[PDB]
Structures are given as C-alpha cells and as structure tokens.
Amino acid sequence: NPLIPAIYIGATVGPSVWAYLVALVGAAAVTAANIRRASSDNHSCAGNRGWCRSKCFRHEYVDTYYSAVCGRYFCCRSR
C-alpha cells in the first residue's frame, strides 16, 4: 500500500537491500532518491551519527526511521 519509504532517500542501504528497492520501483527512482550502497546491510545512517549493527547497546537505541536502510541489521543511534 505505502510506496517507497523516505528513509532510503538520502540514505545508504547495502547490496541486498539496494536490489530490493530497485524491484519496487526502478534504478531511476532509486538513483534519484539519493540512495547510497554500502559493503553490506550493515552501514552508517542518519549522517555520521548512527551506524548499523546486529543489535544496539543499552545506552543507545535503533533509529526506527533508518532501521530500513539497514535491513537484517539495525541502525543504532545515540539519543
């Protein structure tokens, strides 16, 4: 129902997630929404403030907004 999410925009997903967003739309809207690829689902998001790890520490959390660009992992951040 809901079209592509805004997180992928100006974000940075991995190789598997990238190919996914492409199928939903196409390499055009995928390259126009400002989407960067990373070594894998684990990458940095929300600018140089959050990162992606299998899980996050207690003093940190999971930016529910960028949890998408992450994929199987979770983009944790500092509140």
From Swiss-Prot:
- Kindly list the places in or outside the cell where this protein is found, as annotated in its UniProt entry: Secreted
**Disulfide-bonded cysteines:** C45-C75, C52-C70, C56-C76
GO BP annotations listed: defense response to fungus; defense response to Gram-negative bacterium; defense response to Gram-positive bacterium; killing of cells of another organism
Keyword Glycoprotein in record = no
Q: What tissue expression does the UniProt record report for this protein?
A: Expressed in all tissues examined, including hemocytes, heart, hepatopancreas, stomach, intestine and skeletal muscle.
**Where is this chain primarily localised?**
secreted
A GO CC term?
extracellular region
Q: Which UniProt keywords apply?
A: Antibiotic, Antimicrobial, Cleavage on pair of basic residues, Defensin, Disulfide bond, Fungicide, Secreted, Signal
- Similarity field: Belongs to the big defensin family.
Complexes and interactors: Interacts with intracellular coagulation inhibitor 1/LICI-1.
What does this protein's UniProt record list under function?
Answer: Significantly inhibits the growth of Gram-negative and Gram-positive bacteria and fungi in vitro.
Question: Can you name this protein?
Answer: Big defensin
List the top taxonomic levels of the source.
Eukaryota, Metazoa, Ecdysozoa, Arthropoda, Chelicerata
